[PDB]
Design a protein around this ligand. Sequence first.
Ligand SMILES: Cc1cc2nc3c(=O)[nH]c(=O)nc-3n(C[C@H](O)[C@H](O)[C@H](O)COP(=O)(O)O)c2cc1C
Length: 109
Amino acid sequence: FIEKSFVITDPRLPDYPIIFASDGFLELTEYSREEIMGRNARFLQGPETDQATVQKIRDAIRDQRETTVQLINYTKSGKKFWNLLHLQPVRDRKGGLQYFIGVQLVGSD
Ligand SMILES: Cc1cc2nc3c(=O)[nH]c(=O)nc-3n(C[C@H](O)[C@H](O)[C@H](O)COP(=O)(O)O)c2cc1C
């Protein structure tokens, strides 16, 4: 889904850096690709983000399972939005986790 907001992260590098951010992710978050690359996606969180939901994401990553959650995130300018976030593990030919894809399916409402 090239036309959506998504990032691809590399679990095989320290702290799951973003290695690709789609045009839609730039549009949603207001950050530049240069401001995003190599970061962990948690930079989108802020004071109003529910930690119980952050824990659910941790668990999904630990267990390498697909999941969907809703949580408050923040654009570069500090604007709050509800993010319906879908996380999808991608495995290589040998069954080993290779990427995690995160789609911000809906940004607010
Ligand atoms: C592919 C992928 C995409 C993610 N996208 C978001 C996102 O859009 N917003 C967000 O708040 N966290 C997102 N996260 C979650 C954080 O990167 C992080 O995994 C989460 O905050 C739990 O880890 P922590 O407790 O170490 O922060 C994403 C994670 C992955 C692997």
